[PDB]
Write a protein that binds this ligand. Structure first.
Ligand SMILES: Cc1cn([C@H]2C[C@H](OP(=O)(O)O)[C@@H](COP(=O)(O)O)O2)c(=O)[nH]c1=O
Ligand SMILES: [Ca+2]
Length: 129
């Protein structure tokens, strides 16, 4: 896989962000994770986490996996990096997302994310508290 440029347009919630990619505004849904909705427990904390991570970044990158690049709602499906740190993994590592939505063919970072989740669970962080 490879990283491609994007710029932030706006934070949305824990696992969705609006980015400008190839010069076009798109909502991206983060691969392989599920944050709680804003109205659910830890929802706001996930939203804030992602917000801070993407707003503070000098350099946002999009990395598509090998399979489907857009979902049925027209959201881009990607691993999103903020100054080289993967947002998807960071959420999981902090117990602010679950590994989830693991479909065959867009599952390249699965084992990296599961290892993060196991460590979050060990530490009994947030969702695992
Ligand atoms: C993360 C992800 C979600 N989705 C779809 C599945 C879910 O369909 P349903 O809307 O029918 O439940 C929805 C979950 O996204 P949200 O967690 O953003 O709601 O998005 C994909 O199709 N592919 C993916 O990789
Ligand atoms: Ca969600």
């Amino acid at each position: 896989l490879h990283k491609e440029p994007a710029t932030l347009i706006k934070a949305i919630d824990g696992d969705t962000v609006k980015l400008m990619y190839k010069g076009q505004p798109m909502t991206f849904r983060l691969l392989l994770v599920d944050t709680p909705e804003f109205n659910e427990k830890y929802g706001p904390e996930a939203s804030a986490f992602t917000k801070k991570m993407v707003e503070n970044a000098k350099k946002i990158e999009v990395e598509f996996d090998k399979g489907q690049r857009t979902d049925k709602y027209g959201r881009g499906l990607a691993y999103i990096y903020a100054d080289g740190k993967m947002v998807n993994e960071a959420l999981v590592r902090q117990g602010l997302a679950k590994v989830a939505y693991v479909y065959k063919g867009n599952n390249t970072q699965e084992q990296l994310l599961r290892k993060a989740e196991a460590q979050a669970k060990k530490e009994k962080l947030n969702i695992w508290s």
